[model samples]
Target chain A: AISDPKYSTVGFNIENSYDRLMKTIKEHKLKNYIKESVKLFNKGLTKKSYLGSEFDNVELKDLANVLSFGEAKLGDNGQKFNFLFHTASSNVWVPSIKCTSESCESKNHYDSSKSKTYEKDDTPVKLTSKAGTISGIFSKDLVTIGKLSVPYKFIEMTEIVGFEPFYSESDVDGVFGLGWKDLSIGSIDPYIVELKTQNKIEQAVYSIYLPPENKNKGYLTIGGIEERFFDGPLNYEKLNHDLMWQVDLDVHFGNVSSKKANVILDSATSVITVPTEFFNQFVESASVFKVPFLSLYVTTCGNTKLPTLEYRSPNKVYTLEPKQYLEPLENIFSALCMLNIVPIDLEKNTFVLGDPFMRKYFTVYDYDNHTVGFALAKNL
Target chain B: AISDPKYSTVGFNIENSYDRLMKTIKEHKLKNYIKESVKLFNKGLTKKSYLGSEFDNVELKDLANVLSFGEAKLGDNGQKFNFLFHTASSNVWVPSIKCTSESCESKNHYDSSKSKTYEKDDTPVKLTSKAGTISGIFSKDLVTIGKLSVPYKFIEMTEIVGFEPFYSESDVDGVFGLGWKDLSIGSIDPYIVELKTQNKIEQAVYSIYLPPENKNKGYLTIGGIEERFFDGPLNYEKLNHDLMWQVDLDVHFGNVSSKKANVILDSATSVITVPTEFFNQFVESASVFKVPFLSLYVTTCGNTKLPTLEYRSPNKVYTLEPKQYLEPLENIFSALCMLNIVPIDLEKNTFVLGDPFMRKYFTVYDYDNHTVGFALAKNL
Candidate 1:
């Protein structure tokens, strides 16, 4: 019913969130999944983060009041709402209504009838992720984040479907994709996208510094790369896909073996998705159980020495130390840790590395060559 | 070898034929099928007929002058050769050089050495017949058919392949596809297609007045339809296909059964192609041999009483008068007759009606609405 306790938005679209909340439910059916997905968008922002708005480069220590969001109001006398500013999604802001698990309430959707600055072009745009349904329509909306504001230009989400089971274990009203305009649904320029065209950022790049899991401390730098957060030369991997923060890498499950794969470093895709065939190669001795969408696999805290999964792109190799993938197994089997990875049939040799991966490596998303850069985390 | 004595063409490209010819052989492996498929080009005409150049509505009785045909000249100082002026094909003229039935030969192709008017563009065009063995290239040559001539525009063939089988029992140097330009390979405007564009022809309709068997007589009329060829109202069927000269009809096998089908009247194909399922229904008490591509059914002179194969479109019923489909069994089976029809699996209810059906009706191909009309032949 209330906004994320950690976030405060001058404007938040409750109506927008309601529609998207229900949408995620009917679609992927991943409740904890949606939570983890939206969590990344708000992660490392400031104390007062918003889902649907963008912000300026703020200090990591002063992260609490980054003020990361805003909402829209329909025509004259139209109702107004807020959006969840996001970093992992290139899509413009969309709203969400669900906040905590065990909640099935609705009210946070964008009701066009209430917004004075809403225009419906309803353009069809495809983001194409494991989550979300519909080709979806695009609309315009006024955007406000922190003290900054941009006149109406948002890819308003018309409807969402297919992932109903996503909100039970999560909290966030919605996600305002701030990845790249090239991957923006309907190419609706996200606030971060316009920042470049409007000459707002220091450079056309944004870097994310996720603190160690034990610390829960991190922040994102936009417009320029933060040389301090990463130690080595920022090696980059050319994007193998048009959408999503993607790079192709050869994945090795310990020294069990390695296989080439195009991987997407998405903030929203909760657990990593490995093709069933790819997962069968080796589970790091972890046993598995089929969960909704993704399943559970056994892991133990002491199993940290198990050959850590290594993702080697031509430009970088990110390690998934046992601690990263071996999380406290869901279903209360924390004592018996599990591989936080889902299995799927991917015709293309590709995989998804979610939050846990970023938790280990500070990453940078570049729009210049549409590539991604990575370096060992020093800020954490 | 000499050309078809009945046809006197100023020129017709021979190189083009080898490629298209081989193409047809590899696919349909049927001789003369390419010629018929392309001939119906007047299959589409805005106004008039030009054997080689545009026409000014010539008389029906004096239709002998519209002899359109031309061959290609390849390379610098290429040799000049002949092309068969045919009323059946709509393709740019092609030449043929059958190497061997088992293994094809080469080099009887265009010399491309003596032609003063040859220019090489080598455009790739698909005639889509079943016999080609090369992607081939296109070139240009000044085409002269009878007394008419057109500036270099015809696609010159760089290569051709397949069987040393053509021009054995009959003769036709090359076919100038006069069919619809919509289906033209490389959209090479046929001699008759440009007639209307060149402000030639009396009216826009053309008639094909074919004489019965034992005579092998029939000539295509362009620019105007001959009233003398039919006795009654020229009842017509709507064209069902986008490209080919097609009409939808229900076929009846004597009193046994009937089925609806769309038929394309082709000039290159020899025998009417019956859908395997459709042909399986009834063969007029005739036995069938599933030959390559086509099928052969026993027929005899006394089989007149064997229910006639009648094609019923919206306005006309064409009878295969026992004598029509009944022929001496192909390959020297003298006592029994064989239906000159091929059988193929057609997912849709479609068939290609060859000359046999054309023989019963003097057809008119109208480009305006893209319809094919048929009238019982009175002139024959």
Candidate 2:
């Protein structure tokens, strides 16, 4: 399995590529291709997940792998929780076990029984978010990730007091932090931090590969990149702070600069978010208008040749052609519309490019270079 | 791409093994691992394609790739039609180009303008299915698959007349034939045939790696099998008829031989299909009556621990304990039961083992041996 070039890299799906050529000439075969394209353009939607995960191999592509604190040398699935990895806040890593609350429906909880080395620091740690206040215990213990094991501190959620609608367990059992230090909680060492500290990765580099819509594939590629997932030259930007990413992105709609600020890249958050003020401005500027009573805006599927949004990130310019900015709504009439960006409030100077935005771009976090890189989503 | 082995096989994820010991013993950490096992017992639903193609590389995996007609070369995604690879039936290899009806909404029709070696076989050919009748033409040209090129023939659906709902086109534009020669149409050379004839593959062998449900990843591992995709020994069963397959399975319910038959392996079909007679018999044997009016059997998600469907194939015995046999339906009350086997008719001699069955097993179609191999889903 180690010397076969037939599959040295992931195979690229042709249906995924563009303008492929064959033998010599197409003497006669135009009608069928055009017809198929038309069908695709008007086809109905088939919903799918935006990201996937794995604990150890290709079989568990959509798992949320949360390594248990206090290490065991045996490389087994029992030592880890299928947890989601977060990018925005490198808050205390939390497993579901601490949740004594009956409302907690998390499937992967950190039980002390399996760990041979468990230490209880019992320092109460509480984090606040749109979901509300989540209270848990902060402690240090040995952890395992792939092959390297190290000591680290994480939070074990005992209770989430807020909107029960969003506070309970989710598709993932817990959250694995992957953001900059001190972003989520004080003294909380994120997974990436400990990994880099140990020099465990090939070149202090890893990449993020999000699946295309309706396709179930996702990856937090460690050590280098699967070149098949990206195309053209690798694009780069300063990390802004070890994966607490943002690169002077200013979105301009029509004549108004969205007044958007530095971008925040968080894999945990489900959608893109910006200040309502900037959003309203962009809406009005484009004459797209807001949803009168639906708590949103109304615009074509970004199809209809509408005006575009100019996203100037550092030295590069990426055009958010209508489709790129305005997505389809789930409801017929594209209620499926999820422009991916949601309106939110923050330091009034920071905007978030959540998983929504991340899904469209293949990103690389270069720990050694202290620079982030981007490439076409098609490559991802 | 043909000699590297770092990826010669599939990558193993961590969650796959058991009883892994990392460092310190969990003298005070036994509860978490224990807690997780309880969650696993009550857990439900982890849903999850087979086969892919390549001509030098690019084009296959996710595509409308039903290879048309008999032997030919000049492999092009165009001739393939971006279709799904089916072990059962290699249906009409129509490209979106053949769509004559205004309703033919296909995304992967071959645009003759883009291909350099596309030829027209204006010699009209027609095929029919449950949807209605399909008329097209037969032609020959150069077809490249992987690194080899050969001549082959295929049909281009000129027109689809009937069930508009099913005729407009499907998730895939064509059907990639992976069965015995002429399974879909007569005198046609599918991709496999050409590969074997040209002596291009490493061992006249290839394996199918379907993306797990809900996660994006699918493959038609060309050449030797990807060891990662199949654990343990390489298993095999004689291919009854190039395309027709069955592991000589005998399903027993209670003291009765529910009398299930040949496990037809068809990737094109999605659900399990049995004879209405055998289905009713199993329903009775299991004491799960038929649906009041839906003409189906009654059952829940099998979560409460129901009986098992014991299956003995040629060389092995496997059990579909309640949960495995009684899949949950889309509705609640677990009313919400999907005894997923749809009854069909055969020469009273064959019973199908569709995608549902295939999803649970790793298969290899060995052209050299003219045999098919199967191992457990865990192995898959």
Candidate 3:
């Protein structure tokens, strides 16, 4: 079993796997393609004006020209786009499409004399539809280094404002980050596997189906990587599902010792978080053992520090330790910090996970293999 | 003239004016425009993968196409194009545009050895463009309602994200939005005028101008309305200038008398927020006051009885007292209180103004005359 004595737990180490993924992408010349696409998407267009001025005509013409193009090519087939890459933390992918449509006129003050009031009317003017949909896709199914097989289902739209080159000159077509619950791919599965041999008997296959209309829907598939992490078909759990557990922890103010704290299991979450109150107490108590309060900071140096703890249940007080496998220079810091907690004069409910505590025990993921696997070593 | 007696200081009420601006937009038909624009921008274009999808090729094409049309019409000296009416909070306008270049591509793979990646570049590509300018024209300068004319200046390209649609539905062209700082019609001169009409002209308009590009390398207009509101042009001091004076109070444990702290202010805020520590202390102290502690349960009908002071800050606090307001309800809970004390934990900064504190003030937004005004009012 994947067990680290220092950080007492059993789980597969994703550290090495993540490094391998990034290295493979670099070995292949893929950065140029990604950069070129972003540069073209960011080209600025001509300006437009509503007020009467010297360049007003020029501005209007420029806007009208764009709209004209939008109208003329309304039904063209979309481009086959994909940008799936792997990182040390997770697999990332993006699927984008080009489209054109009429811009809808909004209600504004037209004539005040009519009744000393404003009127609502849709301007029948045509504005070219210049729109692009960008999203990140994640999958555990890997086909090759430059080539990856992604499920058609785990894609979600990313909200990016003013990405047009004409609007803002910001580089990058939205971010396809592998961090947290940003997109479906990031949230779909926790574990991914790549075939060691490229031309083996098994072909790289991936496929995903769109969700229900009401559900968050965006699906994409590439290569021949069929998502097979899960043994059964995908299903949704209703809010009122009996199996869905929502436990409330009535934490005492000064309790530093870990008793029985309810832990939530979510494959989508990457890092584990804890309540500030409990975290402070735990850190203070641990100081007695010569463990300096390791200030948790997300540093650029890549020297991440994870925490090890002892979990005391009614039946057993298990001593959870750190992995001896961690490199000597890799400083592990406590990751038990609250996310998005605002200090106001009100009782706020926050979600805290025993992430640092849980990473030691489980290889959690809903990868193509739907089950959250708890393993004993690096390779399951 | 804007002063807070409690803090013994004078500053503009930015939040008060911000609320009024939003309210004015709602009163006008502009609410629909803002909401619709936001919605369209949020829901971008995506390719139809499912054949029977509601947004099929035709629907997608229709939704993505935006067209603006006008007859080959001419006016005085061929200067007449059908005027499309647009309004801004201010009179200074800047022209901007957006355009789409090409469709992005991706590749598919069958096996590692036989994998082929192709850029699905489509041609006859419809390059679209849209243009619009944000103006800082004042309300008084509005030449006409529908076809209004105002003293307008064409801002440099760097002044704003070149005028483009703030939202779009598809990939033809991206949308644009007026940056917060660029929404200036004019500045408000710090002068109090006689209230001859119900809509009194509280401040005078300060003109806006876009200096030649030779001076400003970036097209961005740094200072918009600050020229008239504050003595200086737009800078870090002016942009981040605080208009509201603030005070703090401390509360001891188990004391409702602490909650009875009085606040005397020359000016008022749109809302007042309190920290949880003070709230909890006040709740415990409420036991000392003769006021019966009524634990009201909130349901669909809403809480009928005065809610027991929970650790959470009250969502709304309405104090109609003109100069000095007494926390009679709060006093019944706590007695010992301290004011303007910082928390020991630098990170745990608490306390805030709740919504009830905001609606009790007279709020003014003089965009044409760049100044924010606030006064004590019985109602919002």
Candidate 4:
């Protein structure tokens, strides 16, 4: 019957999201560029926690990411919540009823009084990132994602600041972390951990399939990898660290090679980022024009003549084409497209592969074996 | 039969222009906000010359202006040139054939070798403004605006710097300054003075009629005011300073009044700016929401309930409504409109009335009497 290639996986739908819709096309790009630039500048002053999880120090190439959200339910009230499925962190948190911050006023808050299955922990917790600071208390409750349900410990934010217009405009209730427990506050087991411990899944493996069409719903399959979501045999690589989906990589263009780079796969970042030294070398090799005023880089589009970048792992090589890295813009620029790879001055030989890379390749993280798998996305 | 409401005027077509078209509506505003904020920060560090001319230091409320461009012919070759008709300065300058700056590469340069009417004066001139700096040599040439032509002294830019992305994107070739001769370098006679001295017009007067519709071409009448373009009698205000189109004004909102102010009429600025002290008081009185992230102030659209501002001239009361000061926006905001009036901390009791005011009223500059005339515009 060829009824969807069988896989031991629990699937959930992902919706593409943005903060707000601007008045004019020109205005939107302008504001985005400024915001991204400011965030990048701020990222320079902060520590590792700013990028994503404190366990790994990685640079967010660009903050203008169009996040994919998933729906979940909390407690007996079955209150619907839309959350950012972040792979870099291990804590799930949402604004609580007690939060009176101006930024929190717009968000839907979680109420323990209304939930029958709510369990109080009373553990104070505070998390800080480049976006903002969020302080709350730890609690446990029955959480549901798609068809599976489990009792999970998570934070209920009581205070939020520096989140600003973004949090208010995005309409996202909270963040659902998909990383290891080491990335969480106080080493609390993340929802994914509970999914396995409670016998909700057969394997501690998950795959993310981001559909190319923005209107199409993406897929996040927990328990096991979705075989039908990607083409070809999945290439697996050993993780450099257990905390993050980190890999030791050698970035190469023909014979020229970057040093052994500590690369992390981050779904929250918008663009692929490399150390400034390597970035400058790549720009020079590609001969792309740099718009210094806006700190933007661009190249002519149509037939992309730029060279491909090969990220070589011990087991396999993943190639990134110019088309995958160059975002074709409509106007406000002389060139047809801008380079999606940005420069970040992190620790020597460090790189962060963000959504631009994820959008091109399907990725699977296996918690049981501590390995990451990659394959070409199919039927996107 | 009416003879087009005849006046002693030679009319020129005015085209509304912008820098570039962005891909999405959100991008445009984002970029503009960043650019304006950066320029404003730079303005704080620079001297008087940065705003407009060295004569007066007036703060530009906002820099996102839609300039009205007028066509002109230079020398015997009759090279077609488009210029920004500015009332803040008295110098007419264009990129010269000798310029080798990267910023000048995109602009149309003035070539003297092709014109038999070009007279070489070889006087070094350097001008600096908030936008950028231009250094050139002065020369005499036959210049024409509409039907009038005269031998005039102007700067031919040889070196350009700091003028970046904006200059290249805007596509404006040069600036035609119309002010008293004192605003010019070495007090060289501006083009307007030469028009009268060379018997090109009966009176040294020019009126501007900026159309409200972006798609519609505005009208620039030289030598006389276009009476048909306005609805009522033109009220004249005495110039506090002859070097600029400066006037003494008392800003009033009902009985609440600002101290005596030196107001300048600048066609280049985009908004009506007030002193920070008065601006704070005005905001407190009107109760507008301030978006501190972008330093933006907005009020809800649809039947605005805000108060009116009255600029009390010695001879007339220029009243401005909330509708006139609020620009209706489509998206990227909760409110439907943003305040076109911005805060600028200039010399105590100083104001700059920009395009928002000009678009609402027809203005006439009587160079002979050193007076500025204002009246309600008719027929949009």
Tens digit of lDDT per residue, candidate 1, span A93-121?
34422212222245355555566777767
- The TM-scores, one per candidate, come to 0.35, 0.38, 0.21, 0.47
Model 4 agreement with the true structure over B278-364: per-residue lDDT tens digits:
666666645455432344565566534577878986667898887777776544433446677777777678888876787778888
- Displacement of residue A364 (Cα, Å) in model 2 is 96
Q: Cα deviation in Å at residue B90, candidate 2? A: 4.8
Candidate 3 overall lDDT versus native: 0.23
Q: Report the C-alpha displacement of residue A195, candidate 4, in angstroms.
A: 40
3 versus 4: better DockQ goes to: 4
Q: What TM-score would candidate 3 get against the native? A: 0.21
DockQ of each: 0.00, 0.01, 0.01, 0.02
The residue-by-residue lDDT of candidate 3 on B5-84, one tens digit each, is 21111111122223343455455433333332222222331111111111111111111112111111111122111111
Model 4, residue B24: displacement in angstroms? 8.5
How many clashes in each candidate? 136, 116, 134, 23
Report how far residue A220 has shifted in candidate 1, in Å: 99
Clashes of 3: 134
Candidate whose lDDT is highest: 4
Model 1 CA lDDT for position B319: 75
Task: State each model's CA lDDT, in order.
Answer: 0.50, 0.49, 0.23, 0.68
TM-score of candidate 1 to 2 decimals: 0.35
lDDT string for model 4 (A101-207, tens) is 88777778899999989999979888788878988988888888756788888889999988666677877879888887433446676677678877888877877
Assess the local accuracy of residue B162 in candidate 3 as a C-alpha lDDT between 0 and 100: 33
Query: What TM-score results for chain B in every one of the models?
Result: 0.62, 0.67, 0.25, 0.82
Q: Classify candidate 1 by CAPRI docking class.
A: incorrect
Stretches of candidate 3 off by over 4 Å are A1-159, A162-271, A288-308, A311-319, A322-371, B1-380
